[PDB]
Amino acid sequence: ARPAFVNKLWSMVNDKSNEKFIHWSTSGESIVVPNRERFVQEVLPKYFKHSNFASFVRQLNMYGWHKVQDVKSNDSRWEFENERHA
Amino acid sequence: ARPAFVNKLWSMVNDKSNEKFIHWSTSGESIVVPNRERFVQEVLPKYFKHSNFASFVRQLNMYGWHKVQDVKSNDSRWEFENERHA
DNA sequence: GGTTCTAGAACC
DNA sequence: GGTTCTAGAACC
DSSP, X not given: OOOHHHHHHHHHHHOGGGTTTSEEOTTXXXXXXXXXXXXXXXXXXXXXXXXXXXXXXXXXXXXXXXXXXXXXXXXXXXXXXXXXXX | OOOHHHHHHHHHHHXXXXXXXXXXXXXXXXXXXXXXXXXXXXXXXXXXXXOOHHHHHHHHHHTTEEEOOOOOOOTTOEEEEESOOO
């Protein structure tokens, strides 16, 4: 039995009906959430009760996932990568 | 399935090996703990991990049990009675 | 009231 | 790594 958060993230990134809100990158090295707000109100509520993006991000951190900061100087786009890679 | 606290209290007041530390009054209307300290170190640890008397008392309150204050003016003696009676 | 589910802790 | 236990939440 994997932790509930790991299971939920897995099912949400892989479920085809969440495609437009959260999905793997073509390479699989990261998870893409095109628009934070659409995801927060269309996907989060199906997996967590009293869900909020802040919690989601904290949880992801617990599992080694960090926000990709590659925007040079669309703050609604979020991408996550894990500390553990090949 | 009854709450874990209810089960533990039940088993500790009824278990014969805890007799000298915690037991029903002859009438059954209350629970007698002759000496708080002996009980805290001889019984509590068999039922709760990182047990302390303060928690025990709070829990008892959650279930309607209150400390009997019948000492006129042996602060080690504790007796508990429940709000719900005949 | 009693059974089934969802989780994490405990155990092997 | 996988199974079993202990709890409370969910469900009927």
